Design a protein around this ligand. Structure first.
Ligand SMILES: NS(=O)(=O)c1cccc(NC(=O)NCCCCO)c1
Ligand SMILES: NS(=O)(=O)c1cccc(NC(=O)NCCCCO)c1
Ligand SMILES: [Zn+2]
Length: 257
């Protein structure tokens, strides 16, 4: 199907998903000198205290930690957003080498990985409806650099052995996503898309300025996952990132001077 290989990777996706060449595709390079400070942007409101994680799933392109989104338990509000967006899942994109892995770039710099906390706009009732709307999703993107370990990531790292291959899932309750956030909620924001097929143009991107640091051992454990299913030839799940796409008629806004 689509993937990240030589014959089915990002440069092939437009053949099945013509919106890949659309007007608001993601990710993009964030040119920090060209981003415009907008003093009218509100602080983000991240309300994760009642979050209910349920499960972790290897879907063959990343792993998703999924949450109960049937009530307003973990929500993102404020910032550029109107209304309330519910956390449905988070996942990461990462590299085969510490010098690559992020989807967004900052002044062309690539980070080792990028966390996506995915939220949907409650006025659309469910995630499947929301992805059909230009303001249907808000994805909070957080860069990962390699250095000190991130203690709040370790429970994720340690369960990965149980979901090595595509289609495997494991119970993953009581995980607190607040342990994945940096100190500052300063952010850049722009209208964009899902970064994997179907590449729908439904995302308000909110990318935090401050990266989190994770250890080399933590990211090494991401790289032991597999894209394939069990009993299929082993292909390490690495370099599951889409490169930067043209900014076209968009302006990136910054919440900070
Ligand atoms: N990236 S994409 O336009 O969705 C794309 C490009 C090239 C091939 C495919 N899909 C397939 O080849 N599916 C057949 C799977 C054969 C694996 O043994 C999808
Ligand atoms: N990478 S991202 O822009 O945060 C994002 C967020 C939510 C959904 C998606 N894309 C998908 O789920 N695509 C479906 C992939 C095949 C089913 O596993 C991407
Ligand atoms: Zn993603």
């Amino acid at each position: 199907h689509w993937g990240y290989g030589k014959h089915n990777g990002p440069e092939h996706w437009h053949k099945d998903f013509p919106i890949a060449k659309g007007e608001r595709q993601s990710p993009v390079d964030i040119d920090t000198h060209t981003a415009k400070y907008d003093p009218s942007l509100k602080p983000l409101s991240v309300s994760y205290d009642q979050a209910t994680s349920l499960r972790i799933l290897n879907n063959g392109h990343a792993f998703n930690v999924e949450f109960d989104d049937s009530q307003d338990k973990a929500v993102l509000k404020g910032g550029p957003l109107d209304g309330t967006y519910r956390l449905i899942q988070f996942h990461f994109h990462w590299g085969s080498l510490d010098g690559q892995g992020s989807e967004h770039t900052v002044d062309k710099k690539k980070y080792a990985a990028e966390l996506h906390l995915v939220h949907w706009n409650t006025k659309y009732g469910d995630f499947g409806k929301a992805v059909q709307q230009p303001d249907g999703l808000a994805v909070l993107g957080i860069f990962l650099k390699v250095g000190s370990a991130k203690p709040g990531l370790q429970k994720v790292v340690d369960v990965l052995d149980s979901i090595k291959t595509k289609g495997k899932s494991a119970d993953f309750t009581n995980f607190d996503p607040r342990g994945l956030l940096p100190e500052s909620l300063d952010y850049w924001t722009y209208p964009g898309s899902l970064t994997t097929p179907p590449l729908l143009e439904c995302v308000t991107w909110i990318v935090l300025k401050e990266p989190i640091s994770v250890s080399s051992e933590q990211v090494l454990k991401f790289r032991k996952l597999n894209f394939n299913g069990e009993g299929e030839p082993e292909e390490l799940m690495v370099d599951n990132w889409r490169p930067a796409q043209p900014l076209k008629n968009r302006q990136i806004k910054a919440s900070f001077k």
